[PDB]
Design a protein around this nucleic acid. Structure first.
Ligand SMILES: [Mg+2]
Ligand SMILES: [Mg+2]
Ligand SMILES: [Mg+2]
Ligand SMILES: [Mg+2]
Ligand SMILES: [Mg+2]
Ligand SMILES: [Mg+2]
Ligand SMILES: [Mg+2]
Ligand SMILES: [Mg+2]
Ligand SMILES: [Mg+2]
Ligand SMILES: [Mg+2]
Ligand SMILES: [Mg+2]
Ligand SMILES: [Mg+2]
Ligand SMILES: [Mg+2]
Ligand SMILES: [Mg+2]
Ligand SMILES: [Mg+2]
Ligand SMILES: [Mg+2]
Ligand SMILES: [Mg+2]
Ligand SMILES: [Mg+2]
Ligand SMILES: [Mg+2]
Ligand SMILES: [Zn+2]
Lengths: 30, 115, 81, 139, 100, 148
RNA sequence: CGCAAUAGAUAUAGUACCGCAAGGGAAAGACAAGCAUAAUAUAGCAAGGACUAACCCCUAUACCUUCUGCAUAAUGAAUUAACU
RNA sequence: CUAUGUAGCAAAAUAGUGGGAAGAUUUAUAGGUAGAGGCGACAAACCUACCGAGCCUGGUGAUAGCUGGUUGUCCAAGAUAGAAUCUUAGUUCAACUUUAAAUUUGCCCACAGAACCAAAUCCCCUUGUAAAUUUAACUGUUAGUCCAAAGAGGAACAGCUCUUUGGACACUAGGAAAAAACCUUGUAGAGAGAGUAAAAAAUGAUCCCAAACAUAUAACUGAACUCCUCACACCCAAUUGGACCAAUCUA
RNA sequence: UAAAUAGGCUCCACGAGGGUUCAGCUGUCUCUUACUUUUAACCAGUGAAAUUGACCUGCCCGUGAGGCGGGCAUAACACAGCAA
RNA sequence: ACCUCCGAGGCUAAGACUUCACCAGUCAAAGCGAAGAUCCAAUAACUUGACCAACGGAACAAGUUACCCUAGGGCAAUCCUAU
């Protein structure tokens, strides 16, 4: 689990998965 | 090893979603590119230092004009990450032998006469 | 220690550069000519420019020498009287 | 002895004259005066960059103080005077804050006005008529 | 050792110039390209070099090849590379020598 | 070096440009040897440049004498009392003309570090800042946490 | 187009002095450093930017030579003058 | 044998304690043995304080692939393939560098093309460029460190030896705390002008270690990069080219 | 010896040779103490030497340490000790 | 690579290739005729050889310096332990 070069770190951070927000919260609506 | 990068052509294919996102058009493309350097040649391989020295982009931002023909694009596809390319716009036409000394290039990329 | 903690400012800087280069991708997928159309249209200018380089390189030679410059050095003893 | 330097005195005094104001033996002994004088001149050269940087940071501090006197941070003042197309720089902004308080009061009022116009515009839906101060003047 | 091509396609090669130095027969000789004892390929006639893919029909006098072609199905063929030199200049010209 | 050098503030002689500009240089003495080799540029200047300079500056009294006998020099005197010497030995006529014009184009103050680049005698118009500008006042002038 | 008292001979002298001896072999005669007048005051390569103001504020890892760069890793320098 | 002394009283002494003290003892005086030699109850012991080879003068300014040094101003080009060598602490050739000179193509580069048994590489029409080859003449460097990557050796580790492609360093400047090797940035001066680049954390042994802060609109700050007013030869080692010049003597 | 890795070809005499043991003796020690002399510290005279880049010469933690970074401390100045 | 696995000691002539120098080495159209270095020695000769295998080769030289002197340089495969 070695460390990464810093620029590879930034590339991994910027390209991180962002999930699609659900239209409504399930708790307060089916 | 570290080697020159051959970019697949698939990337250089404007989509119907890209066309309305920038002020362009598939048909009737644009004559000249206005190109500026926004990154250092240092810390990059020599086959980019030489390209930049050839396109006249030695100095920093300092915009410079080039043809939009594939013989030059092949060079700009190697240094595409150290430059900003915008398309020159001529909404008043090429200047005449008069109005050469009274031109001006606005930040939007339009060449105009008498400011 | 060795690992770092990539900030938000760095992410925003990187996204700025990514967007600029995506625009660059776009402005290179539409050339005015094709490979065959362009061929030769700049030949005359290139030939004349290299001929200018040649004529510059083949003109080196010592400068002239004038008698006036040599005799002007006698002025280093000019006196009033 | 055919040739002997007859004027080493003046070459020494050329370097000591720049060290009379030093402290220690290194204001009369050449072997030390030279090294410290050279360091002095190198700092003298390299210090102009810091002079500019420091005066600018002093001006930013004074402007932050003055602008906070009127309930308005420094990001707002500069980032919303330019949106009113006033190209006053920071030296003259500091001078106004110290020596012309009411003019600076007016400039701060203008900045707050433009800030409010921006907030109101962005809060709205569409391109409703622009603010009375938010209208750009073209060249 | 440097056993590789030394004149690539579309190069002007004069008489006697070596086209390719090889160990095995990677590139077989073609039109105007001669072979030496060490399998070097050299340009017999001044011209321009080209590379092509052709059909292979070995000498019956040779044995290690005349038999392998005998072990191939109907409709089979051994294709192989060749290097030719299309000659550039003509053999000669005729000029007036005497008007008698 | 700055620390190792005097300094002054930006100033003029007698509020020079306020009423009427006055030219500070008032006297200029040239010593030119009639024979010395170092006095060649000086001799050229006197022979073909000093008359024109005298005409262009009628407030400057220019004396020229021929008794240093080996070395020239120009001594410029000003209204405010300052003197200033300059060497013109082994210099060209172009250099001497440029120098003499420079002398005639400056006030006789000291050439030292000007601390400020702007000198103003009435720096404030609206009243210089003091900690009670931009600060309110309260009823009857009470300090915080008072009673009466 | 040789030196001018650290040069020119080593030389005022092969003396003084060193060595048992062979032998070695000098010096000199006509306001530099160091101090005193006047000890010092938080803080730090001793300076620079400055400042009304000496300190206080901000900046600032001595020099030469050797090792791939060397925080001084190591070598050399108390300092002045002359000679090199 | 111990203590003092260690620039000491002394370049081996002082105080005590000790061995011999009619003998192979100790000792004054003159003579002899002379340096690869003498003498030696052999310890490489001693031959005028320093003997595994005295001392002085001469050859001698010994030689030194080793250490140390090498003196005015300013500008400019300028760096890590390799081969042989009683050779790896060095030299010669090449490669690279510099100057002067001649000539005309040099670099980048698509399409075509390079075998049977993944990155890319080679080659050229055009195109962007202005450089490249050749000749004359010299010196200097040469088997460097770190980082990304692909391999071989040691685990796939030991911050490990080696080969290759690239970058940086030994050159400027700003950042990550200090920071040669990461990120940003080069062509140089003055300015009390301006715009930017990179750049902030999330959820065992002397003495913890910036202080703080959950919610006032996202922009601002930030270089020698760039723009601005003026001026311009005026920020690399070894090396190489050039412009000036202090002081002395002579005409 | 309480306890031991130590000591225990024949061949008188001798040894500042090496090892061991009995008995005694004693500040060697358990455990140091007092006094005297020299040294010492002060006054007066005479007066060196190694050493020395410059110093306006702090502590803790980190980096790779009086001097760098981040915290802490901090009016100046002798005299006698100590040795991290 | 003391990394990974094995052996060897006819003449003339355009043009080229090469073991990253040089020295060596290599291919060759046409044309004419037939089908491991240098120096040394013996030599009329046409030319000739061993060593140079430390194989770019001193013509012929080993063991050793505890008496030495000078110039200088100086995140463990196998494992121990706790959850
Ligand atoms: Mg700035
Ligand atoms: Mg003498
Ligand atoms: Mg003498
Ligand atoms: Mg003095
Ligand atoms: Mg230290
Ligand atoms: Mg020392
Ligand atoms: Mg010598
Ligand atoms: Mg050697
Ligand atoms: Mg340069
Ligand atoms: Mg080509
Ligand atoms: Mg610049
Ligand atoms: Mg005995
Ligand atoms: Mg005393
Ligand atoms: Mg420490
Ligand atoms: Mg003390
Ligand atoms: Mg070769
Ligand atoms: Mg034939
Ligand atoms: Mg050998
Ligand atoms: Mg060999
Ligand atoms: Zn709920």
């Amino acid at each position: 689990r070695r460390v990464m070069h810093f620029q590879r770190q930034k590339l991994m951070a910027v390209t991180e998965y962002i999930p699609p927000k659900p239209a409504i919260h399930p708790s307060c609506l089916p | 090893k570290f080697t020159r990068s051959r970019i697949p052509e698939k990337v250089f294919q404007a989509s119907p979603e890209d066309h309305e996102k920038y002020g362009g058009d598939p048909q009737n493309p644009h004559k000249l590119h206005i190109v500026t350097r926004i990154k250092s040649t240092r810390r990059r391989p020599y086959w980019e230092k030489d390209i930049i020295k050839m396109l006249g982009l030695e100095k920093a931002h300092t915009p410079q004009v080039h043809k939009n023909i594939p013989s030059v694009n092949a060079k700009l596809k190697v240094v595409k990450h150290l430059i900003r390319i915008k398309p020159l716009k001529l909404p008043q036409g090429l200047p005449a032998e008069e109005n050469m000394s009274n031109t001006c290039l606005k930040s939007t990329g339009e060449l105009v006469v008498q400011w | 220690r060795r690992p770092r903690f990539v900030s938000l400012r760095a992410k925003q800087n990187m996204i700025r550069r990514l967007e600029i280069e995506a625009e660059n991708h776009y402005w290179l997928s539409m050339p005015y000519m094709t490979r065959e159309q362009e061929r030769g249209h700049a030949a005359v200018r290139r030939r004349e420019a290299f001929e200018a380089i040649k004529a510059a390189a083949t003109s080196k030679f010592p400068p002239h020498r004038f008698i006036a410059d040599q005799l002007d050095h006698l002025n280093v003893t000019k006196k009033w009287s | 002895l055919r040739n002997r330097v007859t004027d080493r005195y003046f070459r020494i005094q050329e370097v000591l004259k720049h060290a009379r104001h030093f402290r220690g033996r290194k204001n009369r002994c050449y072997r030390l005066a030279v090294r410290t004088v050279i360091r002095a001149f190198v700092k003298c050269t390299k210090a102009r960059y810091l002079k500019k940087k420091n005066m600018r940071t002093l001006w930013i501090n004074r402007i932050t103080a003055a602008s906070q006197e009127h309930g308005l941070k420094y990001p707002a003042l500069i980032g919303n005077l330019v949106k009113c197309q006033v190209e006053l720089n920071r030296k003259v902004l500091a001078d106004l804050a110290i020596y012309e308080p009411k003019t600076f009061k007016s400039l701060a009022a203008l900045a707050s006005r433009r800030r409010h116009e921006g907030f109101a515009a962005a809060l709205g839906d569409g391109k409703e008529p622009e603010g009375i101060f938010s209208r750009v003047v073209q060249y | 050792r440097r056993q590789g091509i030394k004149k690539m396609e579309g190069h002007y090669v004069h008489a006697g110039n070596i086209i390719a130095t090889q160990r095995h027969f990677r590139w077989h000789p073609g039109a105007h390209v001669g072979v030496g004892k060490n399998k070097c390929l050299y340009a017999l006639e001044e011209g321009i070099v080209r590379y092509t893919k052709e059909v292979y029909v070995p000498h019956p006098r040779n044995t290690e090849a005349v038999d392998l072609i005998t072990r191939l199905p109907k409709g089979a063929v051994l294709y192989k590379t060749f290097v030719h030199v299309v000659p550039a200049k003509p053999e000669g010209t005729f000029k007036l020598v005497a008007m008698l | 070096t700055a620390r190792g050098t005097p300094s002054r503030f930006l100033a003029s002689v007698l509020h020079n440009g306020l009423g009427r500009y006055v030219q500070q240089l008032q006297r200029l003495s040239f010593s030119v040897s009639r024979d010395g080799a170092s006095s060649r540029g000086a001799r050229e200047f006197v022979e073909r440049e000093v008359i024109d300079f005298a005409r262009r500056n009628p407030g400057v009294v220019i004396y020229v004498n021929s008794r240093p006998c080996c070395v020239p020099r120009v001594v410029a005197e000003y209204l405010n009392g300052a003197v200033r010497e300059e060497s013109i030995h082994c210099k060209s006529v172009e250099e001497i003309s440029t120098l003499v014009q420079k002398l005639a184009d400056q006030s006789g103050l000291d050439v030292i570090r000007i601390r400020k680049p702007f000198h103003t005698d009435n720096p404030s118009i609206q009243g210089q800042w003091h900690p009670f500008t931009n600060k309110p006042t309260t009823f009857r002038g009470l300090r915080p946490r008072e009673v009466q």
